[PDB]
Design a protein around this nucleic acid. Structure first.
Length: 87
DNA sequence: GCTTGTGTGGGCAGCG
DNA sequence: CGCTGCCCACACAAGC
């Protein structure tokens, strides 16, 4: 989406100049989808699993269908969201 | 190989 | 007024 990722402060709106791609939540991996919520530890929880997220938040390994079988690693959740808190 | 399934991609309304 | 929550079709890979 061209609004913002499900991360905290990542308003890295789709910019082809920057090396990032977009994707949707692991709808086919609910439990795993759920830990993504654990990464969205902020009150300002962005859109749900229906919205789209960008590459930078996960490891290339877990990027998408290019993972193991056809989706990300069930044991991988976007931790690259941020260091802690922006200013 | 072609067709179907899952990933991919962006928007509008209600409340501080 | 801006942000959060949920939906549909197409391309590539797998199956027949």
């Amino acid at each position: 989406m061209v609004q913002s990722c499900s991360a905290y402060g990542c308003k890295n709106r789709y910019d082809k100049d920057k090396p990032v791609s977009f994707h949707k939540f692991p709808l086919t991996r609910p439990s795993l989808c759920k830990e993504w919520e654990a990464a969205v530890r902020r009150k300002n929880f962005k859109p749900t699993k229906y919205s789209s997220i960008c590459s930078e938040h996960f490891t290339p390994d877990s990027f998408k269908r290019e993972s193991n079988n056809k989706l990300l690693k069930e044991n991988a959740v976007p931790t690259i969201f941020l260091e802690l808190v922006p200013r």
